[PDB]
Amino acid sequence: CSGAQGSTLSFPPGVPAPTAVSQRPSPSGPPPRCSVPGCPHPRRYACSRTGQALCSLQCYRINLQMR
Amino acid sequence: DVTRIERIGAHSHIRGLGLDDALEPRQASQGMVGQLAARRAAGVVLEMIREGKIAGRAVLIAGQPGTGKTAIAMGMAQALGPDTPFTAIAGSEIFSLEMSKTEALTQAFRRSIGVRIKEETEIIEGEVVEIQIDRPATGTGSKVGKLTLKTTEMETIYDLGTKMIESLTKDKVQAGDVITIDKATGKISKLGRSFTRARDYDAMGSQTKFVQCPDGELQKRKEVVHTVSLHEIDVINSRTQGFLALFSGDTGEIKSEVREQINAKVAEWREEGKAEIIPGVLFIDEVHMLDIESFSFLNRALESDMAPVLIMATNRGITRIRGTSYQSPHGIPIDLLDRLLIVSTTPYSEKDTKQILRIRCEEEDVEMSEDAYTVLTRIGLETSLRYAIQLITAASLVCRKRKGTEVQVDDIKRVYSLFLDESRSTQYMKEYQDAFLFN
Amino acid sequence: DVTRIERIGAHSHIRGLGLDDALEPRQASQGMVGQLAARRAAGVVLEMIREGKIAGRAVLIAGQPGTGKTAIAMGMAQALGPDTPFTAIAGSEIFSLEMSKTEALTQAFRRSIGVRIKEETEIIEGEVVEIQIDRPSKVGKLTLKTTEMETIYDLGTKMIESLTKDKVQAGDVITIDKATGKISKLGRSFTRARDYDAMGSQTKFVQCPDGELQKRKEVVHTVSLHEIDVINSRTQGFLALFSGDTGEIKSEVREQINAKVAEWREEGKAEIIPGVLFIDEVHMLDIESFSFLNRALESDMAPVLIMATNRGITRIRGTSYQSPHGIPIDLLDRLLIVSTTPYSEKDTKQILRIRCEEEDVEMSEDAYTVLTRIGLETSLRYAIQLITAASLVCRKRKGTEVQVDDIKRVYSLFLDESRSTQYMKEYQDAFLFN
Amino acid sequence: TQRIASHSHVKGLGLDESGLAKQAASGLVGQENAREACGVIVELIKSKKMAGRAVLLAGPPGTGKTALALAIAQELGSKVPFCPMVGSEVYSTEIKKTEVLMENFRRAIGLRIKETKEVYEGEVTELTPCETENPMGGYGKTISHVIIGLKTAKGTKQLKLDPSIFESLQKERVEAGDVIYIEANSGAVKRQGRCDTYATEFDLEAEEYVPLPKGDVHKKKEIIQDVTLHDLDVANARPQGGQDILSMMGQLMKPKKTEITDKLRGEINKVVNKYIDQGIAELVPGVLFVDEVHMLDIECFTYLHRALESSIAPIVIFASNRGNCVIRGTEDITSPHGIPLDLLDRVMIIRTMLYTPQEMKQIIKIRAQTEGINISEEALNHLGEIGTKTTLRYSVQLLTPANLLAKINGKDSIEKEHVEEISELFYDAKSSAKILADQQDKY
Amino acid sequence: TISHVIIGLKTAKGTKQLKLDPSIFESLQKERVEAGDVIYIEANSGAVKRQGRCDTYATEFDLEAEEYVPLPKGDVHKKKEIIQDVTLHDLDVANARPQGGQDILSMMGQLMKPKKTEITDKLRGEINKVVNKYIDQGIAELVPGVLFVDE
Amino acid sequence: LRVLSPFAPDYIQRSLFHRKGINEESCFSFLRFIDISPAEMANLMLQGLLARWLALFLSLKASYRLHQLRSWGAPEGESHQRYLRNKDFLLGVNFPL
Amino acid sequence: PSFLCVASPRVTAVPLDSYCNDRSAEYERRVLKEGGSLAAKQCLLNGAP
Ligand SMILES: Nc1ncnc2c1ncn2[C@@H]1O[C@H](COP(=O)(O)OP(=O)(O)O)[C@@H](O)[C@H]1O
Numbered sequence A: 001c002s003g004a005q006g007s008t009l010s011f012p013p014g015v016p017a018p019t020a021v022s023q024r025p026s027p028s029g030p031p032p033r034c035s036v037p038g039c040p041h042p043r044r045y046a047c048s049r050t051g052q053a054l055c056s057l058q059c060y061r062i063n064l065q066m067r
Numbered sequence B: 001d002v003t004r005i006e007r008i009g010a011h012s013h014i015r016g017l018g019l020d021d022a023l024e025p026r027q028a029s030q031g032m033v034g035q036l037a038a039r040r041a042a043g044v045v046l047e048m049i050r051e052g053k054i055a056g057r058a059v060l061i062a063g064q065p066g067t068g069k070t071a072i073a074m075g076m077a078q079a080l081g082p083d084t085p086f087t088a089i090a091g092s093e094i095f096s097l098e099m100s101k102t103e104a105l106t107q108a109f110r111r112s113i114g115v116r117i118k119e120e121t122e123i124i125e126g127e128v129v130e131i132q133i134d135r136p137a138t139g140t141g142s143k144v145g146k147l148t149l150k151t152t153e154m155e156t157i158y159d160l161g162t163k164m165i166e167s168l169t170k171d172k173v174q175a176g177d178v179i180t181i182d183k184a185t186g187k188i189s190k191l192g193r194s195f196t197r198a199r200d201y202d203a204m205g206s207q208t209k210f211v212q213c214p215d216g217e218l219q220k221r222k223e224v225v226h227t228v229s230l231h232e233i234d235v236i237n238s239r240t241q242g243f244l245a246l247f248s249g250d251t252g253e254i255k256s257e258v259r260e261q262i263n264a265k266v267a268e269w270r271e272e273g274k275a276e277i278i279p280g281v282l283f284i285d286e287v288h289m290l291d292i293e294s295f296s297f298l299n300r301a302l303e304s305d306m307a308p309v310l311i312m313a314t315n316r317g318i319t320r321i322r323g324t325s326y327q328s329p330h331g332i333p334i335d336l337l338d339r340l341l342i343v344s345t346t347p348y349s350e351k352d353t354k355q356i357l358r359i360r361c362e363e364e365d366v367e368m369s370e371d372a373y374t375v376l377t378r379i380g381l382e383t384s385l386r387y388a389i390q391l392i393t394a395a396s397l398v399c400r401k402r403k404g405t406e407v408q409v410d411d412i413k414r415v416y417s418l419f420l421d422e423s424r425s426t427q428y429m430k431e432y433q434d435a436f437l438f439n
Numbered sequence C: 001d002v003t004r005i006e007r008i009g010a011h012s013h014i015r016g017l018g019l020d021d022a023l024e025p026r027q028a029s030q031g032m033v034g035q036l037a038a039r040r041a042a043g044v045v046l047e048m049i050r051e052g053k054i055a056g057r058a059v060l061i062a063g064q065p066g067t068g069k070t071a072i073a074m075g076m077a078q079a080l081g082p083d084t085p086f087t088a089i090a091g092s093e094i095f096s097l098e099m100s101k102t103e104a105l106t107q108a109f110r111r112s113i114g115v116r117i118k119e120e121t122e123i124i125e126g127e128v129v130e131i132q133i134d135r136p137s138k139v140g141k142l143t144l145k146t147t148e149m150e151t152i153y154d155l156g157t158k159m160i161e162s163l164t165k166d167k168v169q170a171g172d173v174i175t176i177d178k179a180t181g182k183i184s185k186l187g188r189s190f191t192r193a194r195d196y197d198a199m200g201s202q203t204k205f206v207q208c209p210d211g212e213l214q215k216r217k218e219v220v221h222t223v224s225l226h227e228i229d230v231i232n233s234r235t236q237g238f239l240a241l242f243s244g245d246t247g248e249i250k251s252e253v254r255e256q257i258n259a260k261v262a263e264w265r266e267e268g269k270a271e272i273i274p275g276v277l278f279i280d281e282v283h284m285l286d287i288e289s290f291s292f293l294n295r296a297l298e299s300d301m302a303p304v305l306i307m308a309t310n311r312g313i314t315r316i317r318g319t320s321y322q323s324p325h326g327i328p329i330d331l332l333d334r335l336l337i338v339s340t341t342p343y344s345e346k347d348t349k350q351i352l353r354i355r356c357e358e359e360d361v362e363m364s365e366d367a368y369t370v371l372t373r374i375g376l377e378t379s380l381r382y383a384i385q386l387i388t389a390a391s392l393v394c395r396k397r398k399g400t401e402v403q404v405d406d407i408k409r410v411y412s413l414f415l416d417e418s419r420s421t422q423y424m425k426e427y428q429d430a431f432l433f434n
Numbered sequence D: 001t002q003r004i005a006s007h008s009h010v011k012g013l014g015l016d017e018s019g020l021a022k023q024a025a026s027g028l029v030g031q032e033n034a035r036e037a038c039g040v041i042v043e044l045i046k047s048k049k050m051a052g053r054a055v056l057l058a059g060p061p062g063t064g065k066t067a068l069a070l071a072i073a074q075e076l077g078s079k080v081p082f083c084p085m086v087g088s089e090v091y092s093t094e095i096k097k098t099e100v101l102m103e104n105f106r107r108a109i110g111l112r113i114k115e116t117k118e119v120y121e122g123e124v125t126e127l128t129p130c131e132t133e134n135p136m137g138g139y140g141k142t143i144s145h146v147i148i149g150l151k152t153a154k155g156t157k158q159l160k161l162d163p164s165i166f167e168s169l170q171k172e173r174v175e176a177g178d179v180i181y182i183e184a185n186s187g188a189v190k191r192q193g194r195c196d197t198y199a200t201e202f203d204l205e206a207e208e209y210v211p212l213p214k215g216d217v218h219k220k221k222e223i224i225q226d227v228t229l230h231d232l233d234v235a236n237a238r239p240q241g242g243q244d245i246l247s248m249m250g251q252l253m254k255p256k257k258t259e260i261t262d263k264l265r266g267e268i269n270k271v272v273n274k275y276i277d278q279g280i281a282e283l284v285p286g287v288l289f290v291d292e293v294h295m296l297d298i299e300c301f302t303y304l305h306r307a308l309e310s311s312i313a314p315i316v317i318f319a320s321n322r323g324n325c326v327i328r329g330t331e332d333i334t335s336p337h338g339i340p341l342d343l344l345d346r347v348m349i350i351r352t353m354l355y356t357p358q359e360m361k362q363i364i365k366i367r368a369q370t371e372g373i374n375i376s377e378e379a380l381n382h383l384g385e386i387g388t389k390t391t392l393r394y395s396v397q398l399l400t401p402a403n404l405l406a407k408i409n410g411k412d413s414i415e416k417e418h419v420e421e422i423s424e425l426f427y428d429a430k431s432s433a434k435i436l437a438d439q440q441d442k443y
Numbered sequence E: 001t002i003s004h005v006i007i008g009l010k011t012a013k014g015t016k017q018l019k020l021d022p023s024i025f026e027s028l029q030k031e032r033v034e035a036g037d038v039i040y041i042e043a044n045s046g047a048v049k050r051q052g053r054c055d056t057y058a059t060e061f062d063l064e065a066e067e068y069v070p071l072p073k074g075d076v077h078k079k080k081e082i083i084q085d086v087t088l089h090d091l092d093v094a095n096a097r098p099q100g101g102q103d104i105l106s107m108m109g110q111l112m113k114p115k116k117t118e119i120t121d122k123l124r125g126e127i128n129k130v131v132n133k134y135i136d137q138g139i140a141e142l143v144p145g146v147l148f149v150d151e
Numbered sequence F: 001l002r003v004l005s006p007f008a009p010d011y012i013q014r015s016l017f018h019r020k021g022i023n024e025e026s027c028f029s030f031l032r033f034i035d036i037s038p039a040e041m042a043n044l045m046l047q048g049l050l051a052r053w054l055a056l057f058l059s060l061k062a063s064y065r066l067h068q069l070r071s072w073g074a075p076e077g078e079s080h081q082r083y084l085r086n087k088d089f090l091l092g093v094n095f096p097l
Numbered sequence G: 001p002s003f004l005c006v007a008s009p010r011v012t013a014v015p016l017d018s019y020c021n022d023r024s025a026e027y028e029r030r031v032l033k034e035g036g037s038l039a040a041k042q043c044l045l046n047g048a049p
C-alpha cells in the first residue's frame, strides 16, 4: 500500500516474512600479517608445504629454509 | 535579459503581405513596404492556397539579387500562419548521400501535405489518496488491486485491471502524486505532488516542485489537434516501431507500395470525416540548384492530386541548367518553365529604400536621425540594399560604445569606413593583386 | 638460414641518420652517404622532435627522383627510434571509401601523439595445482605453482563461482589481476601435455611460470591519442582499432579528449610524447586535403609533419592551378623546405658499396667502376637493382666475386627506361594506344 | 608544460574601452582598423540580439585573419560556444555537405542549464525492516518502513525508506558491508561493491573493492551543466538507454551520422523555449568560425543563403585568402574571394593588410618571448629583414630551429650566425620555386 | 566429475579406447552422438563428425529416421605428416574482425552481413610480431612468394 | 589462423607485462584502462556476436556504477599527482547528456 | 494517434530453408529453426540471459 499515513507492506500467515534482516560482520582489529617474525607485511597467501601465512618469495625462502 | 531561441534575423520584421480585404497591397503594412506588383500576385496565390481545391499549381518568383523574393516568400509564410504546412528548402538540400534526388523531392512534397486529426479522449485527473496492490504468494501471476483519487471537489475508488497495474507501478505512483490517466490509451502521466500527504514520509522518494490539487469533476475530456504530414505517415508505415526515423531521417528511398497505399487510406479518412487534409506550400528557394534530372522529376510529380502548391525563387539570368551544356532562362528547362506562373519583382526607389531601412530599425530597437537615414539611403543605392541593412546594427553598437542614445551621420560614416562593401573590397583586391592567391 | 619476416628492402641498409654532437654530418656512416646540408636540416628537425616544445611544425623534403628523400625520412625514423610515434603513409592512403580526406588526415595526426601513463598492479601468474571446495555460502582453497614456489589461496565465494564457470583444472596455467578479481587462462603446462589422447581445438601448451607468484609493480604504457578517440566513439570501440571499420569520429569526442589529456598532464597523471607524421609523396593530396592541413598544423597537440615530394611547378590535384611542388601556396609558407642535391661519382661508389655490404656481396673494383657509370648514365635506383642480379648470375656462373662480364650480361637482360623507351619506338604501332 | 603553437600568444584584441585599438597589446600587433571591426563584432556577439549576421575576413596568406577570429574567441572567453571548421570539413562520406554545415550551425548555440543533484550513499551497516505490532486484518505481519544503516567517513546514519525498496535490494545482490547509493530525486538504488575495509577477509575474491565514501550520508549540490543544441540534436536522434532490442541492435551496429530532420530541430526549439521562458535554462548564442571558406562549393554556398538568413542561426565568421577564383563545383565562374557574388552580398568584409618590416620585427619579438627564446639584437634585425625578403610565417618559423642550433653550439641566445646558418639549411617557398624553374626537366 | 571421457572405437581392422578431453566430448554431444554411431575424430584439430549409425544396428527398428553406414573397412587409427600453407593475408583477415564464432549452430551470425574492411596498419604490426615469434620457435617456416599484376 | 592470432591470452600477457624496454610500446595496452581482462578480450574476438552482446549488457550495468564514482569525489592524484586507474579511458560518461 | 499504422506487405513469404539429404545435416537446420542456443534465443527474445 501507499496512503495518507505513508506506505505499508503485508504478508498472509505462512508467507516467509521474506524481508530477512541483515547485520554487520565483526572482524578482528588487525588484518592477518606475514608469519616471518621480521616481516611487517599483510598475508598475501600461505605456503602449501608447511601451512604458514606469507607475503613474498623472500619470506617463502626464509620460511622453507628452516622447517 | 531574457532571450528565446528564435531572435532578430534577416526577415524577422516581416509578419505578412500587408494586403487589404480587397487584395490590394498597402504601401507599408505587416512589415512589407513598396513592391506592389509581386505582393499583389503573392496575395492571389495565397488565396488559392487557402482555397486548396486545386493540385500542383506553381509559382516562380524572379528579379535582381536583394529585391525581396525571399521577403515575399516569408511574407506569405506568415500570412498563411502555423496551422497550414509551409516547407522551406534551399535547392542544395536535395543532394543527399543517403537517398537519390527523386526521393528527396518526393519527401519535400509529402512533408508539405498536412493530415489533421482531432484526438479527443477521456482523462481522469486526480490526486492519489491511497493504493493497494495484491501479489500472489507464488502462483501464475494474477495480480489485482485498488486505487483512489481526489480533487478539491470530489473523490472515488477504482478497481484496477492487470495492464493498468503494470503501467502504474512502472512510474512509481504513490499517495500524494497528482496524475492524469487516459482511459482510451491506458497510459498514466504524472503532474507532480500535492502539498498534503507528502508529510507522512521517509528519506526522500522524490524531489520536484509541488502542484496544486486538481479542481472540478475527477473525470474530464481532452482534445488535441495533430498535424501529421504525408511524409511522416509514409515513414511510420515503412517499418514497424519505426517512430524514431521521423527525427533521425535515416529511412532512405521508401517503397512505392507504401505511398500508393497511403494515398488511398488518406482519401478514405477524408470520406469518413476521420481526418482533414490540408494541402500546404513547398518553397524551393534558389531552385536553380536543381539538376535537369530533378526538374524532369518536378514535371511529372507536380501533376499528382497530392501535390502541394510549389513556389520557386531564383535570381539568375540566361544561364546553363545545372548538370548540362544548355543555356536557358532562370537556369530552368522550358520543359518545366512552361508549367508554372512567373511573378516578377522590381528594383527599389529612394522612398522604398528609406522606408525598408526605417521598418528594419524599428524591429532592431534603433533610433537614428533623419540625416543618418539620408546617408544610409544613399549607401543603399550606391551599394546593394543588404549592405545598408548590415550597417544598421554596427552603427547602433558604435553609438552604444560611445554612449550615444541616437545614431548620428558620423556613426554611419565611421562604420562605413570599418566594414567594407563588396564593391570596395573588390577594388582593394587590385593593389594587392600579387599577394592574394589564384586570380 | 632462418629467414625472418623482415628481410633486405630498398632502405634497410640505413641503421639511423649519422651525425656528430654538433649535428655535423659524417661523409659515410650509419649506412648513409653524402647529402650533408639535407642531413643537417634533418638533424635540426630531429632534435626539435626530441625536445617536443612546439606543435604543428612541418618540413617539406624536396628534390629530384632517386636523390634520397625517403632515405632521409626512414633514416630519421630509425635515429628517433621506437618509444615515440612515427606514422608513415604514402599520400594516396588517405582516399578512403568510408571516411573523408579530413578524417584520414585527422586520424593520421592523432595516431602520431603518444600519451605515456603509469599504472600500478599486482597480478598472479602460475600453474594451478589443485582446487578444493566444500558446502556448509561456500568455502574453498586453491594451490598455485611457479618454478620458485607452491602456495595456497583461501579464496572467496564469487571466485569459487567464477573458477567453476571457467571450469579450470589442475595443470592449467592461469592469471588473475588481484585488484580487479578477473580470471584469465593461458593454456596447459607442458608436463600435462599427454594425459588426453584427443584434445580441444582451443587448447594450447605453455611453460610453467617463474619468479614470484603475485608480482607487484607499477608499469609504463604508451598509447596514442587516436586510440583514446576510437575507444570513446561507441560502446565497444576498441574492436575497430583492429577491424579498421570506423570513421567520421564526432568532433565533440576529439575536443573532450584534448581537455582530458591536457587535464591529466596538469594533474601530473600522464605525459605527452609528440611523434611524427610522415607523408611520402605528399604532392598528390587533393586541394581540399591540403586546405585541411592549414588548421591541423595549428592545434596545440599536432605532431610534426614531414612531407616528401618529387615535383616541379605542377598542377595541384583537383584544380586547374599550377604551383611549386604541386602544393598550394597557402601551405608552402607554413612548411619549411629542405632540398636534396644529385650525387657525385665519388658518392655513388660509396652508396653502391653500402648496398653490397648489406646484401653480403663481393665485386671487383672494375665491376664497381662500370656499375657506377651505369648508375650515373641512368638513374641510381637501376644500378642498385643490378647488384643482386649480378650476384645470382655469378652463382649460376659458379663464381664467388662478381665481374664486369656479369654486369654487362645483366645490363643486356634487364633494361632501364631510357633503353626500353628507345626500343619501344622501333615497334611502336605493335603496342596499344600511341 | 603545455606545448606552444602558431597562436598561443593571442590573448585578446587589446582595445581601449573607447573601442580604439592599441599598436601592440594582448599578444597582437598592427591591423588596427580590422581589430576595431572585430571589437564591434565582440559587442555584437555579447549583445545576444541578432541571428545569422556574418563577416568575412579577407586578405593575403599570413596576414592574421585566423589570429583575429581566435582573438574574438579570447575576448568572449570559454563560456560561449565558439565552433571552428575548415570549409573542407563538409565533404563527409556519411552525410550530405549541407547537413555538415547545419550541424555546425547548431554546435554554435549553447544551453546553460542548472540543476540539483541529491543522493544518499554509504556502506550498508544493516537492513532492518520495522514491523507494526498490530497487523492489518487477515495478514500475519506488516512493515511500515525499512531502515538502512549507511556509513561514510564523516559518520553513520539510519535512513528510513518505504518497504518497496526491499524488493530492489534483492534484485541488487546486496549484503551487509556493501557500499550503495540511492538517488534522492528518483528513489532508485544501486550497488557499487564490497567496502574496502573488508578487502582482506579472503586472500582472493572476485570483485574490485570500493573505498569508503567521504562527506555525509546525504549529499547535495547544484551544477550548471552546458550542452550545445547539436548535442540535443544527436541525443534525441540516437538514444543510449539499452532496455530494448532496437537500442541494443542500434548500439552494436556501427554508429553513423544521419540527416536529422527539420522536425527534430523544430521540436527541440519548441521545448528549449518552454524552459527559457521559465528561467530554468540560459541560452548563449555563440560563434561559428569557418576558415578556408573558398573550399565550400556552390551547393554549400547556396545553402548558406538560407542558413545565414534563418532567425535561429549563430553569428558566423568566415576567412579566405583567395583572389578572383573559380567557385568550386562550377566550371569557369570566377568570383571575388572565391565566394559567389550573391553570398558575398550577404556578409560584411573585413580587409586584412600586409605588414611593414617594423611590424614583422615586432611580431617576431612577441613570438620569441612566448616560444621560450632569447634573441640578440643583431639576430632580430637580420630576421625582420629575412621576413621582408620572404614571408611572415617563414621568418617567424625560423626561431625554434635557431634556438636548437644555438643550444647545440652551447649558447643561451640566438646569434646572427645561427639565423643565417638555419636560413642556409632551410629554403622558403620563393627560393625553392626558383630551383624548380632552373632544373625544370629533372622532376 | 569429468576429468576426461573414455570412448571405445571399432572397425573391421580392430579396436582402441581413447581418453577424450571434455571439450571433445562437448563436441560429441554437439553432433548428438551415442554408442553404436560411426564417428570420425581428428585428434590434432578437435574436429568431430557423425558418419551415420553403424549397420549392425540397422534392424533396431524396421523404419527410423537415421542413415546407416557399414562398419569402416579402414584402420581405427591413421597418421600422416601434413604440411599446411597459410598466407599472411589469411591471418590479417581472420584476426581483424570479430570471428563469426558460430559453426552454423547459432543464429546471431544471420543478422550482421560479412563485408570487406580497411584492415588497420597496427594489426599487421602484431601479425608480423607473432609470426616472427613462431618462425624463431621452428613451428613455422617462411616462403616469400610472388605477386603477379596483369594489366 | 587462430593459434597464430595476437588475441591469444598468452601473447596478450607477454605483450602487456613481460616487455624488455623500460619504455616499450605494445598492443593491448588500452586493456589496462578499460574493464577488459586478456581472456575476456580473446573470448570477445573468438566467440562472436553472442559475446559482443553479453559484454555490451554488462557495460551498461558498469556505466551507472562508474558515473557515481566519477561525479561525487575529488581525492587529487592517486599517489600524490601520479598513477591512472582501471576504467580511466572510458570518458563516454563525462558528457552531461 | 492509434491508427496511422495501416500499410501492409501485399505478400509475406516464409524465410527460405535449405533441405539436405543427410542425418547430421538435418539436425543443424532443426537447431537453426529452434534458434541455435537457448542463450542466443533468450538474448534476442527477452534481451539478455
Ligand atoms: N519589400 C520589402 N519590404 C520589407 N523588407 C524587404 C523588402 N524587400 C526586401 N526586404 C528586406 O531586404 C533584404 C533583401 O531581401 P531578400 O528577401 O533577402 O532579397 P532576395 O531574396 O530577393 O534576394 C532582406 O533583409 C529583406 O528582409
Ligand SMILES: Nc1ncnc2c1ncn2[C@@H]1O[C@H](COP(=O)(O)OP(=O)(O)O)[C@@H](O)[C@H]1O
Residues within 6 Å of the ligand: C010, C011, C012, C031, C032, C033, C034, C035, C064, C065, C066, C067, C068, C069, C070, C071, C072, C310, C351, C354, C380, C381, C384
Ligand atoms: N644518401 C643516401 N645514402 C645511402 N642510400 C641512399 C641515399 N640516398 C638514397 N639512398 C638509396 O637510394 C635509393 C633511392 O632513394 P629514395 O629516397 O628512395 O629516392 P627518392 O627521393 O626518389 O624517393 C634507395 O634505395 C635509397 O635507400
Ligand SMILES: Nc1ncnc2c1ncn2[C@@H]1O[C@H](COP(=O)(O)OP(=O)(O)O)[C@@H](O)[C@H]1O
Residues within 6 Å of the ligand: D006, D007, D010, D027, D028, D029, D030, D031, D060, D061, D062, D063, D064, D065, D066, D067, D068, D321, D363, D366, D392, D393, D396
Ligand atoms: N596581428 C598579429 N599580431 C601578432 N601575431 C600575428 C598577427 N597576425 C598574425 N600573427 C601571427 O602570424 C602567423 C600567421 O597568421 P594567421 O592568422 O595564422 O595566418 P592567416 O592570415 O593566413 O590565416 C601566426 O603565427 C599568427 O599568430
Ligand SMILES: [Zn+2]
Residues within 6 Å of the ligand: none
Ligand atoms: Zn624487505
